[PDB]
Design an enzyme around this catalytic site. Structure first.
Site, PDB file in Angstrom:
ATOM      1  N   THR A  14       0.801  -0.995  -0.176  1.00  0.00           N
ATOM      2  CA  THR A  14      -0.052   0.116  -0.223  1.00  0.00           C
ATOM      3  C   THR A  14       1.017   1.220  -0.094  1.00  0.00           C
ATOM      4  O   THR A  14       0.435   2.338  -0.703  1.00  0.00           O
ATOM      5  CB  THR A  14      -0.932  -0.180   1.143  1.00  0.00           C
ATOM      6  OG1 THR A  14      -0.985  -1.361   1.676  1.00  0.00           O
ATOM      7  CG2 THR A  14      -2.415   0.485   0.501  1.00  0.00           C
ATOM      8  N   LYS A  78     -18.012   1.196   6.013  1.00  0.00           N
ATOM      9  CA  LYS A  78     -17.334   1.385   7.392  1.00  0.00           C
ATOM     10  C   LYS A  78     -18.312   2.655   8.021  1.00  0.00           C
ATOM     11  O   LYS A  78     -17.540   3.797   7.239  1.00  0.00           O
ATOM     12  CB  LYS A  78     -16.040   1.515   7.616  1.00  0.00           C
ATOM     13  CG  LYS A  78     -15.565   1.589   9.018  1.00  0.00           C
ATOM     14  CD  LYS A  78     -14.130   1.941   8.977  1.00  0.00           C
ATOM     15  CE  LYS A  78     -13.696   2.503  10.493  1.00  0.00           C
ATOM     16  NZ  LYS A  78     -12.235   3.149  10.517  1.00  0.00           N
ATOM     17  N   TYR A 454     -13.869  17.490   5.663  1.00  0.00           N
ATOM     18  CA  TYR A 454     -13.889  16.366   4.794  1.00  0.00           C
ATOM     19  C   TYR A 454     -13.536  16.789   3.261  1.00  0.00           C
ATOM     20  O   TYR A 454     -12.946  15.953   2.560  1.00  0.00           O
ATOM     21  CB  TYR A 454     -14.705  15.408   4.828  1.00  0.00           C
ATOM     22  CG  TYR A 454     -15.099  14.623   6.025  1.00  0.00           C
ATOM     23  CD1 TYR A 454     -14.100  13.908   6.661  1.00  0.00           C
ATOM     24  CD2 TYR A 454     -16.438  14.643   6.581  1.00  0.00           C
ATOM     25  CE1 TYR A 454     -14.433  13.610   7.926  1.00  0.00           C
ATOM     26  CE2 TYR A 454     -16.558  14.044   7.772  1.00  0.00           C
ATOM     27  CZ  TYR A 454     -15.563  13.384   8.540  1.00  0.00           C
ATOM     28  OH  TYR A 454     -15.802  12.730   9.872  1.00  0.00           O
ATOM     29  N   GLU A 460      -8.940  18.891   8.197  1.00  0.00           N
ATOM     30  CA  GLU A 460      -8.974  17.754   8.836  1.00  0.00           C
ATOM     31  C   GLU A 460      -7.799  17.463   9.759  1.00  0.00           C
ATOM     32  O   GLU A 460      -7.842  17.109  10.945  1.00  0.00           O
ATOM     33  CB  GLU A 460      -9.256  16.573   8.014  1.00  0.00           C
ATOM     34  CG  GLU A 460      -9.533  15.100   9.000  1.00  0.00           C
ATOM     35  CD  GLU A 460      -9.875  14.038   8.338  1.00  0.00           C
ATOM     36  OE1 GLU A 460      -9.621  13.953   6.876  1.00  0.00           O
ATOM     37  OE2 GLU A 460      -9.971  13.024   8.903  1.00  0.00           O
TER      38      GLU A 460
HETATM   39  N1  LIG Z   1     -10.989  12.823  11.629  1.00  0.00           N
HETATM   40  C1  LIG Z   1     -11.550  11.665  11.779  1.00  0.00           C
HETATM   41  C2  LIG Z   1     -11.889  11.250  12.977  1.00  0.00           C
HETATM   42  C3  LIG Z   1     -12.589   9.663  13.415  1.00  0.00           C
HETATM   43  C4  LIG Z   1     -13.842   9.663  13.848  1.00  0.00           C
HETATM   44  N2  LIG Z   1     -14.165   8.252  14.004  1.00  0.00           N
HETATM   45  C5  LIG Z   1     -12.996   7.672  13.737  1.00  0.00           C
HETATM   46  C6  LIG Z   1     -13.203   6.211  13.417  1.00  0.00           C
HETATM   47  C7  LIG Z   1     -12.014   5.642  13.076  1.00  0.00           C
HETATM   48  C8  LIG Z   1     -10.856   6.604  12.573  1.00  0.00           C
HETATM   49  C9  LIG Z   1     -11.006   7.866  12.874  1.00  0.00           C
HETATM   50  C10 LIG Z   1     -12.159   8.502  13.002  1.00  0.00           C
HETATM   51  C11 LIG Z   1     -12.860  11.666  10.938  1.00  0.00           C
HETATM   52  O1  LIG Z   1     -13.921  12.397  11.240  1.00  0.00           O
HETATM   53  O2  LIG Z   1     -13.070  10.717   9.641  1.00  0.00           O
END
Ligand SMILES: N[C@@H](Cc1c[nH]c2ccccc12)C(=O)O
Ligand SMILES: Cc1cc2nc3c(=O)[nH]c(=O)nc-3n(C[C@H](O)[C@H](O)[C@H](O)COP(=O)(O)OP(=O)(O)OC[C@H]3O[C@@H](n4cnc5c(N)ncnc54)[C@H](O)[C@@H]3O)c2cc1C
Ligand SMILES: Nc1ncnc2c1ncn2[C@@H]1O[C@H](COP(=O)(O)O)[C@@H](O)[C@H]1O
EC number: 1.14.19.59
Lengths: 528, 525
Positions: A14, A78, A454, A460
């Site tokens: 990766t 997920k 995002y 972020e």
């Molecule tokens: N900055 C990440 C933080 C995060 C929230 N839940 C998570 C679960 C797994 C890994 C990272 C996260 C996001 O909002 O996407």
């Protein structure tokens, strides 16, 4: 013309192929890119989890649309990481035990930012109610509609592919590496050299000038990316940069993993990663179509490989002597510096932590993003390198600290492992954050809408673990503020506003738990 | 019920009345608020320029729309701070001198945030061209359409009130404090007490219990806000909290100010604040409708009060013996802690830096915002107070270090003042930021459209564009371009369209916009 002409990347997987691909696009074909990787003895697809920025920040930058890559790597959705049995004692089990106060021992860590009322996040309104008996709801179900959706195992898109909520991806890592190798070679003019490295050639200053392969061939270049895995063949061996072992902060240092075939039509597919607590560590479950990746992460100081393998096999009803196992013995920590002279470590060669909060691929993306931003000329300005180093140092340490919290604030003390975690010192940054949480104040308050969060990676990266992530874990393990946020005592109109946001999460969860297709059903549409 | 029942605010300047109004709304009439101000002991009477987040982070919270308050306090628009003669030697003058390179010694610090291409701000694309002798344009005129607009003295709104660019506000301090007093008393049930404070009553634990007035009246309360000005009657005197003098970082510590009536039909109105450099410091010019506020900020270690007053009078063609002057002797620095026990310092009682970048009122609404967020109950949690203190510490330092930049990197060396500036101890924070700028890397990269929210712009308030405005304006440049640009021809090309877009916008808008004068005459009509 003082520019880098050639970049050599040691190692595929990766790290290497994400590096090759991102730089292909970033450097706009003004630089020759060579990947040197040994031949691939294929190993069983243990599954890997990601964070939601991956499609925007990486595949969309490369112009690879979501469906195209998911369909080639057996990708599932997920919506969170789900923690099972992290507060109650005894052997691992897929099924959650029951707390003293009568709650099931499960909490979600979903995606997205919490809404606010009078500039106070919803977290704080829930805490007030829970401390004052006005609610018996858990943080996760009160503040995220995604909690209702994951409980009903529904998909984060409707079948016509309209979005419902935030989500990231599960996948086979090696299939993604292959999709990316092939992208990079056909569409980005990367040179793939399938051979072993045997010599690292260096100048008087100790900068790398070329790598020798086993077939005798010499690959010259001006910048080298160590994607060699734990061995750190460039950054640790050749450059002699020391690794900073951080088992003073986390105790896990081994895993035993495999794929488990799965009746997807019988059980449904969970749109989330499960962290199932064990006696000597924990076990991931990463649903894909047809199978699920799992692995027991453990300390070898508190379980032998056998002890771990038996416990792990027991979990899933697997036969230890008729089951295919991968046994990793990883190092936990980071190089004193990620980038020395003209060698940039990316992936496992840079740094690692247990995959407790899906940190592996994000660490790779963060480094390549930061490499592109701090990309050098042949003068290798020391400030450029220093700032790159600083970003990786903080990214890693803040995430180590965050992971330690999962362990230090588990109430479990049955096995010597769980007790041992309580004897480690917390880093100053995370003590300060607990002190803040405990007085009812927000920790790492998001300062931006989800669209920007995002949309723009830099946004972020400045605030990766937000208020909501601290509340998900602290409140999930049962650490609570000492009292509510005092300002709420003076704000009855604001309390009322929050009651509408709690209502909005109920309405959304109800409406969507009805109208959405099952995770299974969306996958079956996607892969057929 | 362990909550604060009553809040007493000492002092009814801009600080006091902003505090009274914000808390009125924040505390939702669950708490009694009293302002104690002596109408005879004047407010400092300055406080005229602002920064753009004022409307979002204050008047919008209070639900007062922009036109309502502007019309009541003689407000003008501000599109930048314009620096005049900061690079060339000699006596002050409103007219800009000429650089060696032949251009007039003026640069703007506008607010309009910079576009990006391939995630690199336009700052960096301009720097590439300038360092490679491929452009002769200065940073300000290359990268901000605001520069064209301020040169043409046009307004930042069209007459139908559609927005053209980002902007902040100029105004009369006393009119704002009056509009705020009256808002707070009529609409927020604040009690205005016109009387002098004579004694601060304290318990065995050193918490304040009430303030005694000269008319014998006793104002009991559970929380006290020191808005008393530099005197710090509660935070410094009564609470015995030390001020941390920071003249090791900035040398100015005095001013001499006044209003100058102004031919707004003849000259037009400048939509910006002017920082006119002098021999022993600098002089602000703050246009409103009808007049302009001005004041020579100086060090008393490098000029006497008369030296300063003469130089200041010379500037404008004023008669020293027949002109009304305000003479301030401000302190520069901050209380070791802003909030001790149950006394919260806000405004000049909390902290100050010279008004070079209009930080005074921002410090007030920042602190009140932070007080509301950390608002205590009677237990006064130590963590709550500590975090409040921390946010004021960082807010202040972030602005101090930014100000130091304006001085340490002036090329002027004529007078002993300007040379003394080159012997400042730079804070670690600003050394690190210069090191970054010099490598061609962005400093405090904005991560957001200005669609995004008071909280957004607060620990790193001063963005990339603001550092480039000052550094590049004084002539400090990166050593070299950002190396990644060497590999990004498609990105370089994209940037050429953004440079074109700033030209087209400046041209189009310098035509279609009304003059600043004309918009003010519509507003105050
Ligand atoms: N900055 C990440 C933080 C995060 C929230 N839940 C998570 C679960 C797994 C890994 C990272 C996260 C996001 O909002 O996407
Ligand atoms: C030279 C200078 C220029 C500035 N320029 C700018 C600028 O351009 N832009 C900007 O944003 N900010 C600027 N500032 C800062 C800004 O002016 C102030 O933050 C604000 O206008 C008022 O501060 P304050 O209300 O805390 O203090 P003050 O105005 O000093 O208020 C003191 C109050 O305490 C009261 N008081 C004292 N003792 C007693 C007593 N015993 N009983 C009753 N009342 C009492 C007084 O009566 C008065 O109301 C400037 C400041 C200075 C010094
Ligand atoms: N000496 C080497 N020469 C070439 N590729 C290597 C070498 N060592 C490791 N790699 C590659 O580095 C990647 C990561 O290794 P691993 O973490 O063991 O899977 C794989 O693509 C390996 O083949």
């Amino acid at each position: 013309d003082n520019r880098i002409k050639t970049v050599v990347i040691l190692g595929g997987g990766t790290a290497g192929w994400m590096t090759a691909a991102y730089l292909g696009k970033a450097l706009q074909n003004t630089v020759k890119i060579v990947v040197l990787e040994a031949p691939t003895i294929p190993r069983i697809g243990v599954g890997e989890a990601t964070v939601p920025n991956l499609q925007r920040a990486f595949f969309d930058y490369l112009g690879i649309p979501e469906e195209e890559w998911m369909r080639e790597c057996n990708a599932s959705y997920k919506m969170a990481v789900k923690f099972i049995n992290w507060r109650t004692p005894g052997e691992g089990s897929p099924d959650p035990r029951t707390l003293d106060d009568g709650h099931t021992d499960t909490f979600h860590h979903p995606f997205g930012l919490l809404p606010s009322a009078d500039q106070i996040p919803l977290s704080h309104y829930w805490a007030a109610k829970r401390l004052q008996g006005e609610t018996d709801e858990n943080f996760d179900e009160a503040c995220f509609a995604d909690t209702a959706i994951m409980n009903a195992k529904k998909a984060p898109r409707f079948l016509d592919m309209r979005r419902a909520t935030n989500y990231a991806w599960h996948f086979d890592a090696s299939k993604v590496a292959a999709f990316l190798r092939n992208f990079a070679v056909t569409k980005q003019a990367v040179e793939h050299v399938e051979d072993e490295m045997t010599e690292v050639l260096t100048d008087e200053r100790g900068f790398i000038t070329a790598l020798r392969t086993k077939s005798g061939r010499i690959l010259q270049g001006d910048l080298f990316v160590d994607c060699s895995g734990f061995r750190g063949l460039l950054i640790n061996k050749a450059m002699e940069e020391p690794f900073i072992d951080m088992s003073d902060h986390l105790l896990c240092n081994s895993a035993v993993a495999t794929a488990v075939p799965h009746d997807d039509e019988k059980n449904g597919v969970e749109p989330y990663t499960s962290s199932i607590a064990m006696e000597a560590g924990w076990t991931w479950k990463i649903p894909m179509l047809g199978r699920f990746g799992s692995g027991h992460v453990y300390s070898d100081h508190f379980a032998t490989q056998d002890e771990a393998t038996l416990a792990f096999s027991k979990l899933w009803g697997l036969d230890p002597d008729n089951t295919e196992f991968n046994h990793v013995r990883f190092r936990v920590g980071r190089n004193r510096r990620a980038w020395v002279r003209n060698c940039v470590s990316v992936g496992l060669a840079s740094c690692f932590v247990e995959p407790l909060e899906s940190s592996g691929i994000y660490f790779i993306y963060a480094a390549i993003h930061m490499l592109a931003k701090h990309f050098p000329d042949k003068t290798f300005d020391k400030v450029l390198v220093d700032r790159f180093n600083r970003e990786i140092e903080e990214m890693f340490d803040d995430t180590r600290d965050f992971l330690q919290a999962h362990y230090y604030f588990s109430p479990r003390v049955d096995t010597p492992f769980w007790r041992a975690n309580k004897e480690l010192k917390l880093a100053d940054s995370i003590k300060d954050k607990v002190e803040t949480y405990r007085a009812g104040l927000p920790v790492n308050l998001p300062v931006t809408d989800e669209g920007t969060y995002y949309g723009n990676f830099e946004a972020e990266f400045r605030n990766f673990w937000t208020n909501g992530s601290y509340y998900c874990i602290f409140a999930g393990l049962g650490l609570m503020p000492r009292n509510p946020l005092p300002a709420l005592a003076y704000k009855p109109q604001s309390i009322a506003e929050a009651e509408l946001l709690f209502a909005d999460v109920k309405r959304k969860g109800d409406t969507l738990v009805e109208s959405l297709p099952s995770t299974y059903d969306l996958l079956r549409q996607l892969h057929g």
